[PDB]
Amino acid sequence: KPDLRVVIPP
Amino acid sequence: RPTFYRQELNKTIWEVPERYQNLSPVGSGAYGSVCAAFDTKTGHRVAVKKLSRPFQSIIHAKRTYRELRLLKHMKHENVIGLLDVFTPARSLEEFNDVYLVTHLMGADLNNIVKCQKLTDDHVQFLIYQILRGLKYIHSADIIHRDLKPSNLAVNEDCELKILDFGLARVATRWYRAPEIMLNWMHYNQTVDIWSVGCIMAELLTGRTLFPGTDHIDQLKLILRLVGTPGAELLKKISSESARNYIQSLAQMPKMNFANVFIGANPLAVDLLEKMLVLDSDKRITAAQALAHAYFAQYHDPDDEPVADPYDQSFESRDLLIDEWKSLTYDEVISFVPPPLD
Numbered sequence A: 001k002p003d004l005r006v007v008i009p010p
Numbered sequence B: 001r002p003t004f005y006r007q008e009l010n011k012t013i014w015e016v017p018e019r020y021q022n023l024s025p026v027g028s029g030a031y032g033s034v035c036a037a038f039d040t041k042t043g044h045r046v047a048v049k050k051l052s053r054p055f056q057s058i059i060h061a062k063r064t065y066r067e068l069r070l071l072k073h074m075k076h077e078n079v080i081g082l083l084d085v086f087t088p089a090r091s092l093e094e095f096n097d098v099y100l101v102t103h104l105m106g107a108d109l110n111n112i113v114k115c116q117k118l119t120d121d122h123v124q125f126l127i128y129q130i131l132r133g134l135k136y137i138h139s140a141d142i143i144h145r146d147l148k149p150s151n152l153a154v155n156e157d158c159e160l161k162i163l164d165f166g167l168a169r170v171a172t173r174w175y176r177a178p179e180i181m182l183n184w185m186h187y188n189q190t191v192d193i194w195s196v197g198c199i200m201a202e203l204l205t206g207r208t209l210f211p212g213t214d215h216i217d218q219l220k221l222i223l224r225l226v227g228t229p230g231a232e233l234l235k236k237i238s239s240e241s242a243r244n245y246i247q248s249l250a251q252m253p254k255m256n257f258a259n260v261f262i263g264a265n266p267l268a269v270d271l272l273e274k275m276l277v278l279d280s281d282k283r284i285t286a287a288q289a290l291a292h293a294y295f296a297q298y299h300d301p302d303d304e305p306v307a308d309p310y311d312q313s314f315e316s317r318d319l320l321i322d323e324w325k326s327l328t329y330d331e332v333i334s335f336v337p338p339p340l341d
Helices: B058-073 B109-113 B120-139 B190-205 B215-226 B240-248 B266-275 B286-290 B321-333
Strands: B004-009 B012-017 B020-027 B032-039 B044-051 B084-086 B099-103 B152-154 B160-162
Touching: B004 B020, B012 B020, B012 B032, B012 B044, B020 B044, B058 B084, B058 B099, B058 B321, B084 B321, B109 B152, B109 B190, B120 B152, B120 B160, B120 B190, B120 B266, B120 B286, B190 B266, B190 B286, B266 B286
Parallel strands: none
Antiparallel strands: B004 B012, B020 B032, B032 B044, B044 B099, B084 B099, B152 B160
């Protein structure tokens, strides 16, 4: 699966 | 029947199964209030929604039934599904409240953008998933009708799901196709492709594409990019007044999208051109878009499933409030939970 990352806000 | 426990939050009684703990009011509306809670059965946090008087009128009852039927049918990795649906009622005689439970995924697209700048890669993967879930949805003869960033949930792995389908029949308006916004004609699935287009453009340039202050102002921004209507499309507009207003407009030529999205992937600009076509019959379909060069790194025909047949004959039945209510009860009664992973 795609090696992408994203930051999720609080 | 699970064990329920009732409690009062924001002046609303919530009676739910004990599996749902630490309920926290997330918000409210004319549709119903929603609570955040932790589901001790899956070990996952979830969104518990309590409908606002589901059966106040024939209209509401039918709308309630439509939402329940729609959510129960949705089974795809890129679309929100029904984790659970229940009512504290012990029979039809006392049936009155309907609770819907869904997965709390992380954050909507707006909150992602607000946190970081996305790479062309992210956009590719994000728009791909949108089209993947849309292919599933459209294959079932369903039209979301209200795609926008706030209706897109994204997790830490950049995975996405489409939520909140339009059930009814600035913001929202900015991602709507023109034939809808002004009721020019009976629209088709491609209205969602128009939305995808507006969303993609925004992710690439960091700017809303058609932020019109009102319907006319937006139509002008739109017609300025894609050009004014041609005779072929005009003949499709059923409203005589609509046709009349269109013809009153000063003709305009389609713009070169490359001149609007300078610096963007040539392939993404091409796809945009294909989605932002004024005539809905000429817009690219979900299935077709997945096969576009822009998604070459994510496309897999054997892993882009369609849906089972979705029976909507109910839309044309004329029933009493209580018939719609009993129908809804039957749906609640027959709900089978999703396999535990």
